[PDB]
Amino acid sequence: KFPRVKNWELGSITYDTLCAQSQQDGPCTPRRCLGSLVLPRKPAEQLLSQARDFINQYYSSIKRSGSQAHEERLQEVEAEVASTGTYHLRESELVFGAKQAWRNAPRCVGRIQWGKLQVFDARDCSSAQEMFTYICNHIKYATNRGNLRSAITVFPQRAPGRGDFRIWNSQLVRYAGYRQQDGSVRGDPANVEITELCIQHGWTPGNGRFDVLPLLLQAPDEAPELFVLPPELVLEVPLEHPTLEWFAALGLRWYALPAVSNMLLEIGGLEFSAAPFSGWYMSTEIGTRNLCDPHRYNILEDVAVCMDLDTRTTSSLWKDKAAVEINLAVLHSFQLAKVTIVDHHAATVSFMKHLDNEQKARGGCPADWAWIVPPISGSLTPVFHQEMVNYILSPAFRYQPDPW
Amino acid sequence: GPKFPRVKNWELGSITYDTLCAQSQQDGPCTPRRCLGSLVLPRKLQTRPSPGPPPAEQLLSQARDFINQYYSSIKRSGSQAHEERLQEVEAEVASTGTYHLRESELVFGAKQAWRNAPRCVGRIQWGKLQVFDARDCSSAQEMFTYICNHIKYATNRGNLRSAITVFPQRAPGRGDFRIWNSQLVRYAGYRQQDGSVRGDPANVEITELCIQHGWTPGNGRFDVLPLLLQAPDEAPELFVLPPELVLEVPLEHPTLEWFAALGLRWYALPAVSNMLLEIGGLEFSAAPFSGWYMSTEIGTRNLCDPHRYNILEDVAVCMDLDTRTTSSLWKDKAAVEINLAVLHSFQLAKVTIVDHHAATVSFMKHLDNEQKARGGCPADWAWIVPPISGSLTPVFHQEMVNYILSPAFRYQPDPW
Numbered sequence: 096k097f098p099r100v101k102n103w104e105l106g107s108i109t110y111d112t113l114c115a116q117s118q119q120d121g122p123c124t125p126r127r128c129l130g131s132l133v134l135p136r137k138p139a140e141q142l143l144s145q146a147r148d149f150i151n152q153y154y155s156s157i158k159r160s161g162s163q164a165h166e167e168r169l170q171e172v173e174a175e176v177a178s179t180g181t182y183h184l185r186e187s188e189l190v191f192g193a194k195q196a197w198r199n200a201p202r203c204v205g206r207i208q209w210g211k212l213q214v215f216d217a218r219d220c221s222s223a224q225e226m227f228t229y230i231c232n233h234i235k236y237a238t239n240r241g242n243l244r245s246a247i248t249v250f251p252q253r254a255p256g257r258g259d260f261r262i263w264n265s266q267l268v269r270y271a272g273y274r275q276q277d278g279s280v281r282g283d284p285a286n287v288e289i290t291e292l293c294i295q296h297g298w299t300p301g302n303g304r305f306d307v308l309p310l311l312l313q314a315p316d317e318a319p320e321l322f323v324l325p326p327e328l329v330l331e332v333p334l335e336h337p338t339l340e341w342f343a344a345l346g347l348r349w350y351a352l353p354a355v356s357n358m359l360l361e362i363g364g365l366e367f368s369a370a371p372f373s374g375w376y377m378s379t380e381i382g383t384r385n386l387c388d389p390h391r392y393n394i395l396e397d398v399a400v401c402m403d404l405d406t407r408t409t410s411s412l413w414k415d416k417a418a419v420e421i422n423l424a425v426l427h428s429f430q431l432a433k434v435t436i437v438d439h440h441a442a443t444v445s446f447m448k449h450l451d452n453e454q455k456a457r458g459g460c461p462a463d464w465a466w467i468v469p470p471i472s473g474s475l476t477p478v479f480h481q482e483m484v485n486y487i488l489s490p491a492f493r494y495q496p497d498p499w
Numbered sequence: 500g501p502k503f504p505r506v507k508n509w510e511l512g513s514i515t516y517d518t519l520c521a522q523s524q525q526d527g528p529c530t531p532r533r534c535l536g537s538l539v540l541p542r543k544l545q546t547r548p549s550p551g552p553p554p555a556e557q558l559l560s561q562a563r564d565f566i567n568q569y570y571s572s573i574k575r576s577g578s579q580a581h582e583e584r585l586q587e588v589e590a591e592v593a594s595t596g597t598y599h600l601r602e603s604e605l606v607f608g609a610k611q612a613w614r615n616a617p618r619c620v621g622r623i624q625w626g627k628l629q630v631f632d633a634r635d636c637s638s639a640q641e642m643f644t645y646i647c648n649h650i651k652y653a654t655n656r657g658n659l660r661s662a663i664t665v666f667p668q669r670a671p672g673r674g675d676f677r678i679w680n681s682q683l684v685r686y687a688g689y690r691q692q693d694g695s696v697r698g699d700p701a702n703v704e705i706t707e708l709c710i711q712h713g714w715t716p717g718n719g720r721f722d723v724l725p726l727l728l729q730a731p732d733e734a735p736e737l738f739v740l741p742p743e744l745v746l747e748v749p750l751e752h753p754t755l756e757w758f759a760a761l762g763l764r765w766y767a768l769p770a771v772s773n774m775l776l777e778i779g780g781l782e783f784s785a786a787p788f789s790g791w792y793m794s795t796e797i798g799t800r801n802l803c804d805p806h807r808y809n810i811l812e813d814v815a816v817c818m819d820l821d822t823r824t825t826s827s828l829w830k831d832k833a834a835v836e837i838n839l840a841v842l843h844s845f846q847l848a849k850v851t852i853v854d855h856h857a858a859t860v861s862f863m864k865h866l867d868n869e870q871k872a873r874g875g876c877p878a879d880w881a882w883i884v885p886p887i888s889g890s891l892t893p894v895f896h897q898e899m900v901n902y903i904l905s906p907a908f909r910y911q912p913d914p915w
């Protein structure tokens with residue numbers, strides 16, 4: 096039947112009725128739960144049914160279901176699909192869809208913000224060069240000298256029997272990973288593949304630890320093109336610690352803008368293979384994951400040794416102590432630099448509020464507990480103690496294969 | 500490729516397939532439309548105490564399955580002894596509605612239930628379990644003796660030893676053996692005149708029950724509760740554990756000298772007493788078991804949960820942190836020092852304990868052992884990942900597949 100949803104800190108119970116509006120399958124079955132899997136395993140009226148549902152959402156949202164503006168808009172959509180196998184969205188529909196896709200994203204702890212999203216229509220875009228211009232404009236608007244603003248730029252939708260618009264980079268700002276000869280990696284190991292791809296497309300690589308990568312941009316059925324981001328567009332914060340002077344030394348830095356560019360935005364059955372979006376960072380993404388993950392910069396032992404800790408044994412919690420100072424250095428540095436950032440306590444607190452707003456507005460909120468709970472200090476945050484139901488609502492941000 | 504769940508580790512980049520989930524005979528809470536893996540007690544993780552016997556062929560099929568598991572585990576699968584055992588069980592169930600386990604079947608079952616528990620990070624140890632057969636027990640008084648014996652053996656003056664005591668199974672038209680308490684050692688929770696709680700809020704209800712059944716209550720933060728033990732069709736009787744049987748560890752910190760003055764302590768033995776042990780369709784409603792603690796259970800959940808002892812702010816204030824802003828990370832700092840104290844104090848007291856790093860590292864090893872042995876390992880990620888320092892442990896980066904195998908430790912309704 097319905098999921099009874101309990102908060103174990105408060106004893107409060109909700110019932111999620113919004114999940115009944117889900118008509119796309121997640122990975123689980125009654126025989127086995129696969130909720131911890133990062134990625135999924137892998138006519139014209141499926142399209143039509145998806146489109147009417149989106150249009151119905153849209154008019155429900157703006158005061159006017161059943162109105163004949165609703166009825167003829169519906170009628171435009173089948174005429175177009177019946178004739179061409181596809182259709183097109185109006186700008187206001189795209190703006191609404193983009194916001195619903197973020198609202199529906201189970202893994203985002205930042206959805207309290209979901210109605211505040213600058214949407215750039217970049218669907219009149221016929222070249223990699225024009226993509227670059229749009230992206231440069233996205234970054235200038237979003238970065239806003241450190242007062243970050245959420246934004247999405249939407250490039251032309253996929254079309255049958257034509258290649259996709261793609262941004263090859265997973266983010267607009269990424270540090271190069273240089274595979275070294277002897278096993279190791281200089282820079283960000285998460286970016287070895289895209290660094291190599293950049294070099295094979297004629298980029299002159301640096302040899303630093305934090306070299307900003309160029310963008311590879313691809314118009315349909317053309318080779319990707321390389322574009323170096325102008326340094327003045329890419330805001331970076333040098334990392335220092337509020338009390339440990341030696342930390343600043345470490346030569347650590349991170350960029351301001353989390354701008355994800357490899358997800359597919361799906362609205363009413365239409366698919367936008369290139370729709371980069373950005374918000375601002377939660378400090379644990381940088382301080383815990385990007386800098387402390389063993390397969391990332393992996394700096395835990397470095398900091399721990401500078402902190403003069405007992406590396407020899409795990410029960411001294413040297414890892415735990417080191418990680419706390421690194422997260423504090425990230426909070427400190429961003430706040431010093433006047434670059435928007437939110438700590439995981441503030442962030443999960445606002446997500447609890449979002450859940451409550453959502454329960455009231457929709458009768459639920461799809462949420463992926465393993466992603467909502469931060470990577471340090473889990474049970475110290477209120478979301479740890481909150482049961483959640485995970486499901487797929489459309490419009491949706493989806494994963495899609497790397498274009499190479 | 501393979502039509503089994505593909506399982507990836509994102510630290511190492513390595514891939515496995517779970518074929519063990521194919522032997523799952525029981526549905527979990529999830530459907531293709533909605534994942535409920537974050538619910539603690541979804542009703543598909545709960546049972547119901549039916550006073551009448553199981554429909555004999557539902558019982559028979561579970562029984563046959565377990566007997567096959569047993570003969571497979573001693574590599575006599577298909578043998579004449581195997582086929583004779585099945586026939587014997589079919590006979591027993593036919594004339595009495597139930598059947599009985601041989602001793603070594605009971606031992607195999609108890610270890611398998613542990614081995615199959617998706618929420619236990621301690622499972623590297625699953626082959627080392629002392630099984631106390633107490634299916635002869637016939638009074639609440641005798642349950643007490645069996646429990647004291649268990650506690651003495653398991654505690655072992657701080658050098659802790661995993662053990663389980665198994666009291667008689669559910670029987671057709673006869674009341675259950677039940678332990679009312681949730682653990683053998685629990686601190687009291689006294690609801691206050693002003694609405695707060697002195698002691699452990701987790702235990703308000705069992706405390707009130709002990710009082711109702713005649714216990715004279717104390718009023719400390721760490722009063723050990725009496726046991727409420729229930730023999731078939733008898734009211735629960737009250738038993739007080741002799742204080743010297745209950746090993747406790749006072750908490751101090753290795754460098755923050757004031758920490759000892761908080762007067763915090765915890766008991767050495769985690770002994771869970773309210774779970775149902777299910778083996779081949781047989782139901783052991785009283786089967787308490789114990790291992791030893793992972794330090795985050797004490798340092799993080801029991802002492803720092805807002806609805807538990809909730810000492811975070813207290814410790815943070817002693818540490819002189821900025822508690823009126825989140826971005827100071829005062830909660831994080833306090834939490835580390837409280838875990839350090841738990842680890843340090845147990846270590847000083849020579850009482851077995853394992854930190855969350857060491858625990859999760861051993862669980863990765865357990866996963867690889869089980870990959871080879873059985874083609875998978877049912878694992879509940881949300882419970883396996885520790886409540887602090889999540890991505891700092893190897894298990895965070897390990898995808899897991901969750902499902903119900905039997906023999907199993909299951910939840911059951913409170914006896915009242």
Ligand code: HEM
Nearest residue numbers: 197200202203204205208245246372373374375376377492
């Ligand atoms: C405004 C501040 C925001 C914050 C603090 C925030 C926070 C987060 C965090 C911490 C994650 C987990 C990501 C990871 O661990 O890899 C996440 C995921 C996600 N976020 Fe947000 N976010 C923000 C804005 C946005 C915006 C503007 C969008 C889209 C318009 C968005 C869409 C998503 C999606 C689709 C995911 C899933 C990530 C994935 O599957 O890779 N977020 N968010």
Ligand code: HEM
Nearest residue numbers: 613616618619620621624661662788789790791792793908
């Ligand atoms: C040997 C040392 C052991 C360690 C370090 C250990 C560790 C843990 C931890 C940390 C949990 C999570 C509990 C929670 O967060 O509430 C757990 C759960 C569990 N353990 Fe183990 N454990 C050990 C031994 C055992 C033994 C001996 C048994 C039974 C024979 C067992 C059966 C279970 C079961 C069934 C759960 C699920 C908890 C639940 O569903 O409520 N464990 N263990």
Ligand SMILES: N#Cc1ccc(CCNCc2ccc3ccc(N)nc3c2)cc1Cl
Nearest residue numbers: 133134205353355373374375376377380494
């Ligand atoms: N394959 C794969 C894969 C798939 C997903 C991921 C997670 C990447 N998510 C990054 C992300 C996405 C959206 C965000 C929105 C806001 C924000 N502050 N950070 C985000 C960070 C990582 C990998 Cl390696």
Ligand SMILES: N#Cc1ccc(CCNCc2ccc3ccc(N)nc3c2)cc1Cl
Nearest residue numbers: 539540621769771789790791792793796910
């Ligand atoms: N309702 C409910 C509910 C359901 C489950 C739980 C979890 C209790 N888990 C306790 C436990 C069980 C076995 C253990 C084995 C070893 C160990 N160190 N700790 C354990 C701790 C708590 C509640 Cl309140």
Ligand SMILES: C[C@H](O)[C@H](O)[C@H]1CNc2nc(N)[nH]c(=O)c2N1
Nearest residue numbers: 131132133465466895896897898
């Ligand atoms: C295996 C596991 O599901 C995987 O590492 C997930 C867990 N939770 C996460 N949570 C966030 N926010 N980001 C992540 O990348 C992950 N990774």
Ligand SMILES: C[C@H](O)[C@H](O)[C@H]1CNc2nc(N)[nH]c(=O)c2N1
Nearest residue numbers: 479480481482537538539881882
């Ligand atoms: C709501 C959520 O399921 C609940 O807080 C869970 C999360 N993970 C857990 N993990 C462990 N080991 N123990 C727990 O009690 C819980 N509680």
Ligand SMILES: [Cl-]
Nearest residue numbers: 205437442445
């Ligand atoms: Cl926020």
Ligand SMILES: [Cl-]
Nearest residue numbers: 621853858861
């Ligand atoms: Cl262990």
Ligand SMILES: [Zn+2]
Nearest residue numbers: 123128529534
């Ligand atoms: Zn699931």
